């Protein structure tokens, strides 16, 4: 199954305050009104980068795995919420053929009623996580609206990724593409509106 | 950077003549402003009591609660809205511009065309308007017999300027475009500092850090070549733009002299209709004229003739046109219907009936 992304999947692209201004930027973004895949857990491709989101009230998702093989021969990301903090490791995991839960390692780190939204990308050997959380009233779909995802971590992993999988009651996956966006910063320096310049001729005009 | 400064000296006089060109622009902006507003020798000021015969200038005269701008000038100021770059002040402040427009305006109301020709000579405003009606071929009694209506039509027409300029900025697009063109030029000049022009980096100290002495100079000379072409392009563009503003300031200085200080007989120069007078108001980077004009507004068809024949003599109107109401013949002034009986005073003779194509037979009265 698939669902419309609407105007969601924008994130703060850089560590810069800007205010009362419209800023043009070129980066990997989820294009406006693109369809995204919907789920109620295959190994997915990673492509250039990923938008991941879920509708939640129960905390049934617990993490993700990322890599090239996602298996044994090389170092690979394990990300888990331990029900107290986020925990991250990059080990050469001889992992099982599917997720499991309590229900060599070069590096490690430690930190329906809601939407949880995330973006994952890897550039020049740094893995980026951005996220946002909000209450919701809609059941089946990504809520038509706008808010921007903020950086959580910026990890110097030095590791490649081409595939990933979910660890875990409904969730969505879409892919970033190289796009030009115009982003509106208000007087508090938050992004409050956006335009996907290639969407249609009015978006080019704006 | 001293390492760049020593390379820039090899290009010689180029850097000096850019300042000389921009200084020629900057000095001229004060000359453009001076020659528009400073046409008045003395700061004339209004009587304390506003006895202008029903005409109401309170919207365009100074307000002491306002800078001393008029009410309409305060609307006009609301509707218009660093790497070695500097902006310089104008010589005349916005308060001095508003004192010149005050003097031009109070001279015009209290003394008519006379303060342009020499000393201001007072005349009552209703009589000044009566002699501005003679300038358009309408006899002065047409004003005094209609003075209350002519005053209401003027007061109402100024009220529509307040509503128009309160409700939309769109009329000020000429002044706002001059702000926008100067902003777009400086935004471009500054953003051209980030460009490489083929150098390894656009950051000058980054070139000095990455490279050895002689290798760096060959890359710094690319930033010098591109930044010099970038600044020459901006100065050449401002010279072409200043020549367009100077042509507009020479036109504004001409409308100050001919529309405000006088009464122009030039068609469509001081607005459409037959010109009576106009009032200057200041605006950011420009001038606004309120051109007051007589427009004829209701009409009837009349039968007409080039001349009338009395006892063999062909009579022509001195100052007027002959017309018939269907059964009688009259002479009128041309720009307002006011019939008079045809007489030996209203007309002049020239020869027998037979020469004129279309003459008519009627009695000329001899008082």
């Amino acid at each position: 199954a698939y669902t419309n992304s609407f105007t969601r999947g924008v994130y703060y692209p850089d560590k810069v305050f800007r205010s009362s201004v419209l800023h043009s930027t070129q980066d990997l973004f989820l294009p406006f009104f693109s369809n995204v895949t919907w789920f109620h857990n295959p190994v997915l491709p990673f492509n250039d980068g990923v938008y991941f989101a879920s509708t939640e009230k129960s905390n049934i998702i617990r993490g993700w795995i990322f890599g090239t093989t996602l298996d044994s021969k090389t170092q690979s990301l394990l990300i888990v919420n331990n029900a107290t903090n986020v925990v991250i490791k990059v080990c050469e995991f001889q992992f099982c053929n599917d997720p499991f839960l309590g229900v060599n390692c070069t590096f490690e780190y430690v930190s329906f009623k809601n939407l949880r939204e995330f973006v994952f990308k890897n550039i020049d050997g740094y893995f980026k996580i951005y996220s946002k959380h909000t209450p919701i009233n809609l059941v089946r779909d990504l809520p038509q609206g706008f808010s921007a995802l903020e950086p959580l971590v910026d990890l110097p992993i030095g590791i490649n990724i081409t595939r990933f999988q979910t660890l875990l009651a409904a969730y969505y996956v879409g892919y970033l593409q190289p796009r030009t966006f115009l982003l509106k910063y208000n007087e508090n320096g938050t992004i409050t509106d956006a335009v996907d310049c290639a969407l249609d001729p009015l978006s080019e005009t704006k | 950077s001293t390492e760049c400064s020593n390379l820039l000296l090899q290009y010689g006089s180029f850097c000096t003549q850019l300042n000389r060109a921009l200084t020629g622009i900057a000095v001229e902006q004060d000359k453009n402003t001076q020659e528009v507003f400073a046409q008045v020798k003395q700061i004339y000021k209004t009587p304390p009591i506003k006895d202008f015969g029903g005409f109401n200038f309170s919207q365009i005269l100074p307000d002491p609660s306002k800078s001393k701008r008029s009410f309409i000038e305060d609307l006009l100021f609301n509707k218009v809205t660093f790497n070695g770059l500097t902006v310089l002040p104008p010589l005349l402040t916005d308060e001095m511009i508003a004192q010149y427009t005050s003097a031009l305006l109070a001279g015009t109301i209290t003394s008519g065309w006379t303060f342009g020709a020499g000393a201001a000579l007072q005349i009552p405003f209703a009589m000044q308007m009566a002699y501005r009606f003679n300038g358009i071929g309408v006899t002065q009694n047409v004003l005094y017999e209609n003075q209350k209506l002519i005053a209401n039509q003027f007061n109402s027409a100024i009220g529509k300027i307040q509503d128009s300029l309160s409700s939309t900025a769109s009329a000020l697009g000429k002044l706002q475009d001059v702000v926008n063109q100067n902003a777009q030029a400086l935004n471009t000049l500054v953003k051209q500092l980030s460009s490489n022009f083929g150098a390894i980096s656009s950051v000058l100290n980054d070139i000095l850090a990455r490279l050895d002495k002689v290798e760096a100079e060959v890359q710094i000379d690319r930033l010098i070549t591109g930044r010099l072409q970038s600044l020459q392009t901006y100065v050449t563009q401002q010279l072409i733009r200043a020549a367009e503003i100077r042509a507009s300031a020479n036109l504004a200085a001409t409308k100050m002299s001919e529309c405000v200080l006088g009464q122009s007989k030039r068609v469509d120069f001081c607005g459409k209709g037959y010109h009576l007078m106009s009032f200057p108001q200041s605006a950011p980077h420009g001038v606004v004229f309120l051109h007051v004009t007589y427009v004829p507004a209701q009409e009837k068809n009349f039968t007409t003739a080039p001349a009338i024949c009395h006892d063999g003599k062909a009579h022509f109107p001195r100052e007027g046109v002959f017309v018939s109401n269907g059964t009688h013949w009259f002479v009128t002034q041309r720009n307002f219907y006011e019939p008079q009986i045809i007489t030996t005073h209203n007309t002049f003779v020239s020869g027998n009936c037979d020469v004129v194509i279309g003459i008519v037979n009627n009695t000329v009265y001899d008082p």
């Binding site: 305050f17 590096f107 938050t190 | 003395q42 000021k45 009587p47 500097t86 310089l88 005349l92 980030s194």
Partner: protein, 413 residues
């Protein structure tokens, strides 16, 4: 000199550009954390035979090496690829400490691409190796009565090692007609052999304990780095500055702005940086350029006088009689409380003149005499008399007809 002239006419002339120079340098960086354990690693419990040299890996920490040469405890010290005093500034993808025991005559061998039986048969280093040998005499520990035979090195090989070729092969080296059969004898030898360390040995035979630091930088980004200094935070003065690697020249000032927790820099509409968060005490600083502007000289012309006044255009007088105009700081002219017609322009309604004991004066220009026109609703003024007036008006009509021969200006002959 600006005019290339000995006579100067009445006017205002721009002669120079003023510029406030950076008075000092500010540096600001994060609070320092996670110092690398080198002083504990140099006190490790264990050592290895040099054919099986032992490596400890170092990552995710900030590095100081200065103790390793500021302390005279080490009987030998050498460094390669980088100078020992510079290492405390630098960054690496990986760091390692490599450990072994050998006789004092062989510690000299351990160098980038160099020869000697320990380098050539036990611990070979590449020609681009970056690292330091730190070593100390251990004759009090590693030597034994009757000799210590627990330490071994490779004495025999058919050819020299490649970089980090940790060869632990052990078959008999045959040196003649004797077949090997895994046993030593006449012209047949085990490839690993011992120094036999005795406490009575001479200093070239005596054992040294060695730690060689080894440093590595790759396509993957750094995990070990040097610490950094920081200064007092000097507001309201012109400085050079650096925050977390954002360099510039300016005056730093307090601000009302509220950067989100991840935001570190603030930018103007032209992308030009105009605020920063301090990394140590999280105030937001507005950045403003150090002041600059044209210097102009006001002169009544040298035909009349040699006095001058000078205008620092757009400058505040704090930054340079002295008078603050809205056009900039004016020096050498009196502020006069009268008003006159504009003799020499300055800006924003200010003009200057030379007048009466004479001095240069600066005043707000007067637009003309005030005049109440004697208006009344029944009074008229009529002229009794006239004057014929003759006015001169002058207009330019044509330039001098220059023409330039482009190939003779550019080249010629």
């Amino acid at each position: 000199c600006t005019l290339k002239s000995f006579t100067v006419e009445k006017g205002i002339y721009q002669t120079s550009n003023f510029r406030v120079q950076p008075t000092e340098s500010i540096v600001r960086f994060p609070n320092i954390t996670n110092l690398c354990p080198f002083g504990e690693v140099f006190n490790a419990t264990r050592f290895a035979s040099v054919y099986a040299w032992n490596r400890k890996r170092i990552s995710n920490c900030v590095a100081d090496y200065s103790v390793l040469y500021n302390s005279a405890s080490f009987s030998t010290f050498k460094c390669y690829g980088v100078s020992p005093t510079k290492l405390n500034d630098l960054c690496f993808t990986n760091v390692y400490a490599d450990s072994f025991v050998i006789r004092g005559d062989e510690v000299r061998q351990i160098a980038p691409g160099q020869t000697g039986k320990i380098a050539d048969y036990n611990y070979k280093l590449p020609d681009d190796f970056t690292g330091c040998v730190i070593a100390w005499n251990s004759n009090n520990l590693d030597s034994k009565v009757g000799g210590n035979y627990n330490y071994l090195y490779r004495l025999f090989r058919k050819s020299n090692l490649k970089p980090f070729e940790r060869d632990i092969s052990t078959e008999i080296y045959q040196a003649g007609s004797t077949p090997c059969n895994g046993v030593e004898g006449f012209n047949c030898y085990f490839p690993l052999q011992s120094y036999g360390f005795q406490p009575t040995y001479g200093v070239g035979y005596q054992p040294y304990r060695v730690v060689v630091l080894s440093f590595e930088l790759l396509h993957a980004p750094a995990t070990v780095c040097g610490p950094k200094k920081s200064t007092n935070l000097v507001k309201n003065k012109c400085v050079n500055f650096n925050f977390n690697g954002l360099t510039g020249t300016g005056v730093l000032t307090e601000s009302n702005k509220k950067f989100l927790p991840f935001q570190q820099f603030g930018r103007d509409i032209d992308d030009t940086t105009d605020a920063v968060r301090d990394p140590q005490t999280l105030e937001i600083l507005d950045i403003t350029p150090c002041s600059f502007g044209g210097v102009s000289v006001i002169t009544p012309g040298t035909n009349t006088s040699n006095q001058v006044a000078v205008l620092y255009q757009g400058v505040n007088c704090t930054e340079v009689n002295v008078f603050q105009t809205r056009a900039g700081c004016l020096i050498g002219a009196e502020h006069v409380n009268n008003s006159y017609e504009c003799d020499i322009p300055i800006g924003a309604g200010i003009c200057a003149s030379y007048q009466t004991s004479q001095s240069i004066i600066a005043y707000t220009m007067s637009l003309g005499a005030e005049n109440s026109v004697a208006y009344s609703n029944n009074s008229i003024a009529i002229p009794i008399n006239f004057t014929i007036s003759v006015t001169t008006e002058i207009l330019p009509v044509s330039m001098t007809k220059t023409s330039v021969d482009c190939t003779m200006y550019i080249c010629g002959d």
